[PDB]
Amino acid sequence: YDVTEWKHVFKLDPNKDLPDEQLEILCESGTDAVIIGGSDGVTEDNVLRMMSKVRRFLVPCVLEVSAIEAIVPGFDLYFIPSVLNSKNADWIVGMHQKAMKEYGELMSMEEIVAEGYCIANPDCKAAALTEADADLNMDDIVAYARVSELLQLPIFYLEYSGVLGDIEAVKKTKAVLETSTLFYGGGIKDAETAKQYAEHADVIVVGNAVYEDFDRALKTVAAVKG
Amino acid sequence: MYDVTEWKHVFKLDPNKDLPDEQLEILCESGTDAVIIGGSDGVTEDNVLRMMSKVRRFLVPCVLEVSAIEAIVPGFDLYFIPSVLNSKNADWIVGMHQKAMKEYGELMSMEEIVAEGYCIANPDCKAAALTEADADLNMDDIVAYARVSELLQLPIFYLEYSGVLGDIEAVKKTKAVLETSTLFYGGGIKDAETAKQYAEHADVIVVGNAVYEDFDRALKTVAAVK
Numbered sequence: 363y364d365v366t367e368w369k370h371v372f373k374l375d376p377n378k379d380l381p382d383e384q385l386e387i388l389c390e391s392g393t394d395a396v397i398i399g400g401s402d403g404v405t406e407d408n409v410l411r412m413m414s415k416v417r418r419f420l421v422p423c424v425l426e427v428s429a430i431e432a433i434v435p436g437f438d439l440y441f442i443p444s445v446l447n448s449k450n451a452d453w454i455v456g457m458h459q460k461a462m463k464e465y466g467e468l469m470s471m472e473e474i475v476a477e478g479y480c481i482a483n484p485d486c487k488a489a490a491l492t493e494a495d496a497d498l499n500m501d502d503i504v505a506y507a508r509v510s511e512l513l514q515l516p517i518f519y520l521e522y523s524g525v526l527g528d529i530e531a532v533k534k535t536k537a538v539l540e541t542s543t544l545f546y547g548g549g550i551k552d553a554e555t556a557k558q559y560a561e562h563a564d565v566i567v568v569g570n571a572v573y574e575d576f577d578r579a580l581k582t583v584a585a586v587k588g
Numbered sequence: 589m590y591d592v593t594e595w596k597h598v599f600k601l602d603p604n605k606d607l608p609d610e611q612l613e614i615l616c617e618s619g620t621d622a623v624i625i626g627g628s629d630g631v632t633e634d635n636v637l638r639m640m641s642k643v644r645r646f647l648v649p650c651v652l653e654v655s656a657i658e659a660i661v662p663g664f665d666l667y668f669i670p671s672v673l674n675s676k677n678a679d680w681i682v683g684m685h686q687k688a689m690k691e692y693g694e695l696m697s698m699e700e701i702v703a704e705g706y707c708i709a710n711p712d713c714k715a716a717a718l719t720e721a722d723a724d725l726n727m728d729d730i731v732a733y734a735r736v737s738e739l740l741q742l743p744i745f746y747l748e749y750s751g752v753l754g755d756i757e758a759v760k761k762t763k764a765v766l767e768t769s770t771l772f773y774g775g776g777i778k779d780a781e782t783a784k785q786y787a788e789h790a791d792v793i794v795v796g797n798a799v800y801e802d803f804d805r806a807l808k809t810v811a812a813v814k
């Protein structure tokens with residue numbers, strides 16, 4: 363696996379229900395990965411059930427860890443978020459230490475990847491939970507980008523949740539990021555918007571839209587790889 | 589840049605104290621692999637400066653361990669930016685690094701920087717009060733902090749005990765789990781034999797305050813490790 367060659371990804375939420383016909387269609391759309399997310403309140407049994415539903419298809423299935431209890435074996439990849447702009451140590455390192463203290467063994471039998479998370483949308487569920495200073499200036503965002511690239515993180519995930527983020531903030535971030543792979547998530551609900559950001563981000567993430575209007579989020583893939 | 593993986597012994601100097609006579613010189617031509625300018629409480633831009641001009645003339649690498657942004661001085665071969673993995677204050681984990689990237693970005697790109705995973709393991713010292721470190725830890729805690737250090741990609745994991753010698757057994761176990769980063773052990777080393785004993789597991793032993801209390805004896809630690 364190599365994220366430096368991805369262009370598009372779907373982020374599903376084990377918390378919501380998706381008709382299996384649609385789950386099947388996404389896995390076989392041409393996307394580069396299907397990431398199982400879950401901002402919060404995620405249950406182990408929903409992750410497990412999803413993992414078994416997507417394991418058959420060839421696309422790499424990724425687990426985005428957000429709760430120790432939700433760790434489940436069987437995924438091709440494991441992404442460990444590290445919220446860089448959190449005012450709380452638990453979301454940067456703390457929760458990460460409790461996890462290694464508890465599953466340090468199983469955390470050697472998988473390909474794990476650290477993501478430098480930058481939550482730039484101040485009004486979403488994610489920014490409230492992590493006590494993130496999510497209201498940032500272009501120069502704040504770019505500095506976090508820098509940090510991530512200093513700490514050397516395979517990924518810098520610029521996160522804007524349910525809203526489209528500033529295309530300029532994305533263009534610059536990309537400019538400082540020499541080694542990290544920039545992921546952009548936030549408001550991409552169609553081919554038009556997918557194209558705009560894909561031009562600046564290495565990878566664009568499409569989640570919510572999948573639930574809102576499936577038919578049209580499906581076009582984000584062809585829109586950036588067609 | 590210089591490769592710390594090839595190092596074994598480093599001397600750590602306090603810019604807020606100066607060595608008598610030709611001592612800085614003997615120390616700089618001793619056989620040490622690097623001379624680190626660090627410092628406690630508050631370091632000053634004036635002290636760092638005076639040190640930097642003094643040590644930069646020798647072939648040995650000189651390093652600035654950036655404890656405070658206000659002491660960021662140009663002229664060093666390397667800058668160690670530490671993240672205190674066990675701190676309760678996000679400032680000490682990433683908050684500083686982002687400040688420096690926001691106020692001194694251009695200076696950053698033109699210097700060779702290295703992130704170091706600090707783990708303050710002595711709950712009774714300046715450093716721990718200063719960083720709000722959850723400094724009371726069993727080998728298990730410490731071992732887990734080192735695995736976070738590696739997930740996070742940090743090239744160095746600094747296990748620090750300050751004024752006291754650390755558990756020889758926490759050193760061997762952390763050395764154990766470290767697959768791809770260098771183990772710096774700092775703490776209470778003031779002689780050849782104690783030096784000899786920690787060099788068995790730590791990749792690098794740091795010798796700090798012992799050069800002020802007993803120069804001639806701190807100096808023997810180099811031979812005792814090579």
Ligand SMILES: CC(C)=CCC/C(C)=C/CC/C(C)=C/CSP(=O)(O)OP(=O)(O)O
Nearest residue numbers: 399400401428429430443453457461487488
């Ligand atoms: C347990 C461990 C090793 C580390 C802790 C992991 C951390 C820091 C998790 C928080 C990451 C979050 C909430 C990301 C946004 S998910 P989303 O896009 O799904 O948000 P939404 O549900 O749509 O509101």
Ligand SMILES: O=P(O)(O)OC[C@@H](O)CO
Nearest residue numbers: 523524547548549569570
């Ligand atoms: O919520 P959206 O608008 O889909 O953005 C993707 C999101 O889930 C990234 O964390």
